[PDB]
Design a binder for these strands. Structure first.
Ligand SMILES: [Mg+2]
Length: 134
DNA sequence: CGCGAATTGCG
DNA sequence: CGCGAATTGCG
């Protein structure tokens, strides 16, 4: 399998797991930032990766783009394809925002179709995903 | 740490 | 014993 350069890559920037979560999606070739989510005060890295993929799906659907999405998170890819985020994060006032976003992303998946291929970024083969925060 | 996949007590 | 609940590599 080879890299599809005409694609979108997503990744999460964490400050702890659980901890603050942000994410972005970038053009795999150029690095152009296409969308970003401001820091969510608490969530898990997995929840962030899930939100990042779904955000990418919504972005690409709006623009009628057929570009694939790359994610380095096998867990998030599975959650998106299952249309179910199997997170164990406690639901309380502290985590209300991340769970609101996750619940809404699930609702979107369960009420829409999409053509975007969702592909695993192979870090061991290809180096850093283009959306990496460092 | 959180995940999926795997391995490990009370009916 | 079964069936699951809970425990035990990778990022
Ligand atoms: Mg990541």
């Amino acid at each position: 399998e080879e890299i599809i350069w005409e694609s979108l890559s997503v990744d999460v920037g964490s400050q702890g797991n659980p901890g603050i979560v942000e994410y972005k999606g970038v053009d795999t070739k150029t690095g152009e930032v296409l969308f970003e989510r401001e820091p969510i005060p608490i969530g898990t890295n997995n929840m962030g990766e899930f939100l990042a993929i779904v955000h990418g799906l919504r972005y690409l659907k709006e623009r009628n783009s057929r570009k694939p999405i790359y994610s380095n998170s096998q867990t998030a890819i599975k959650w998106v394809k299952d249309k179910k985020a199997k997170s164990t994060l406690v639901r309380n006032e502290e985590t209300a925002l991340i769970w609101k976003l996750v619940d809404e992303a699930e609702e979107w998946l369960n009420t829409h179709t999409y053509e975007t291929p969702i592909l695993k970024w192979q870090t061991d083969k290809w180096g850093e995903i283009k959306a990496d925060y460092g």
